[PDB]
Amino acid sequence: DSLSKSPENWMSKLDDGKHLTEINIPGSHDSGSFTLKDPVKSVWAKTQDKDYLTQMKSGVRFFDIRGRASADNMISVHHGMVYLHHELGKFLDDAKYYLSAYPNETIVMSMKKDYDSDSKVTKTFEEIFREYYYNNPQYQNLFYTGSNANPTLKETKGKIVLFNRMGGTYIKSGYGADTSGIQWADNATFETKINNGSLNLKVQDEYKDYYDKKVEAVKNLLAKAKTDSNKDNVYVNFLSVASGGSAFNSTYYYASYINPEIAKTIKANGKARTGWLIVDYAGYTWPGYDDIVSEIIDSNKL
């Protein structure tokens, strides 16, 4: 059977001497937005329909958490202005549970401030994350804390590896975990060095593209990963795109085209490096069309 027939424990079947960078990983964009039900707001604000545990069971390993500091000891999960009805501890507890049941999987968690803090907040978003989550004894042992800038599957499995989109941090483990953080270019394909120059991060995050240009931008970065065997290069390729608003087509409508288009492309490339591909509506299938999460999973070499 191929890896995608067992999406709950697919990383356990790989060689754990691999660097996480060399693994083709399915992520979910604004992972926490499964809570949204409002049909008008959901056109633009909702990007997932499966909860965190169901996403994990479906093979998702990269989680894009964007947040707002709602108190000096709390981060609320957000899409922009829009509160996603739970705090960061919910994601971390779900992750902890999953990883105890599937201990040979790693999860990478991107962390970003998406909206201004509650006006009662006195601390920076990075201080709140560092002090109340990363260093919280409640999540002792859950996070990767090693000093390797380019960690392997073996030293990260059973743990959450920070992908830091907070800016400069005092945290010292994970991607972009230094006092410069990650220089993100807005609505762009870009590359930048991270981890004190140890890694070259290559991103496609052209989130306002219309779908034809979006597909072209995805495929361009997909074509570059394919011929690149450098473990010090890290690819993050977002298939997700903004809706123009509630008058306009939904994020779901776009994903319903982009996902099978990209899944078909990956499948026709066979076993080939993809990078980390971050999708809307992870695990959402359409009869007669390739499934993007499954194809990312099956693109890994055994």
| Catalytic site positions | 29, 79
Q: What is the CA radius of gyration of the chain?
A: 18
- Is 110 exposed, middle or buried, given 0-12, 13-18 or 19+ CB atoms closer than 10 A? buried
DSSP string, 128-171: HHIIIIIT-GGGTTTB-----SS-BHHHHTTSEEEEEESSS-S-
Give which of 292, 218, 270, 294 is closest to 57, Cα–Cα. 294
Our measurement of the distance from residue 177's CA atom to the centroid of its chain's CA atoms, rounded to an integer in Å, reads 16
Amino acid sitting at position 95:
A
The torsion defined by the Cα of 268, 263, 159 and 197, in degrees rounded to 10, comes to: 70
